[PDB]
Amino acid sequence: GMTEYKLVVVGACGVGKSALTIQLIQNHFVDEYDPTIEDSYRKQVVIDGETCLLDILDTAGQEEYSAMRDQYMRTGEGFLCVFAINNTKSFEDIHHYREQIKRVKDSEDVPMVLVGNKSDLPSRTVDTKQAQDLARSYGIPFIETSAKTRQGVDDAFYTLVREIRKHKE
């Protein structure tokens, strides 16, 4: 029947994982959202003329490496790797998130998009060119977003869907 895309949103505390997912799926911006609340979000969408189902895990809570957690992340088809453009530590953590994706999927060829969120803010601390260079070194797209204004948000998620489609060929 209808194709379902299983996406996983990862990244450090406070980068906007929840805000991005709730904006895309529930059409509003949360000014704050408890960092322990983890949910799968679902919506039917049309992407490049294809009607499909998005099933998006907004990861939260604690870092942990039980076999069950590994296996749950293994079911993800594509990963949105989010940092905030005013949080250098969140950008420095991206390497770690990519390595865990590669470990559980046992592949360097996993659909992934690098997302620099909070683009609406002044006084960024992560240079866009440094982020582009990191994405270039991984061979993945890089997209700047604002969960607050929704600039780039749908583009970022739809780009990940397009990468999953491509990987299926």
Ligand X SMILES: Nc1nc2c(ncn2[C@@H]2O[C@H](COP(=O)(O)OP(=O)(O)O)[C@@H](O)[C@H]2O)c(=O)[nH]1
Closest CA to 153 of 44, 28, 55, 46: 28
φ, ψ for residue 68, nearest 5 deg = -65, -40
CB of 101 to ligand Y8N, least distance (A): 5
CB of 16 to Mg ion, least distance (A): 8
Choose which of 79, 115, 117, 157 interacts with ligand X (CB under 6 A).
117
Q: Which stretch binds Mg ion (CB under 5 A): 17-25, 45-53, 90-98, 143-151?
A: 17-25
Give 38 or 70: the residue with its C-beta nearer to Mg ion.
38
Between 17-26 and 153-167, two packed helices, what is the crossing angle to 10 degrees? 90
End-to-end CA distance of the chain: 19
Choose which of 31, 34, 48, 64 interacts with ligand Y8N (CB under 6 A).
64
Choose which of 42, 65, 128, 167 interacts with ligand Y8N (CB under 6 A).
65
Q: State how far the Cα of 50 lies from the Cα of 57, in Å rounded to an integer.
A: 21
Choose which of 31, 34, 63, 109 interacts with ligand Y8N (CB under 6 A).
63
Give 10 or 163: the residue with its C-beta nearer to Mg ion.
10
Q: Establish if 52 lies at the interface with ligand Y8N (CB under 6 A).
A: no
Q: Establish if 30 lies at the interface with ligand X (CB under 6 A).
A: yes
Amino acid making up residue 45? V
Amino acid making up residue 7? L
Q: State how far the Cα of 53 lies from the Cα of 144, in Å rounded to an integer.
A: 24
Q: Are 45 and 92 in contact (CB under 8 A)?
A: no
Closest chain position to ligand X (CB): 16
Query: Which residues make up the interface to ligand X (CB under 6 A)?
Result: 11, 13-19, 30-33, 35, 117-118, 120-121, 146-148
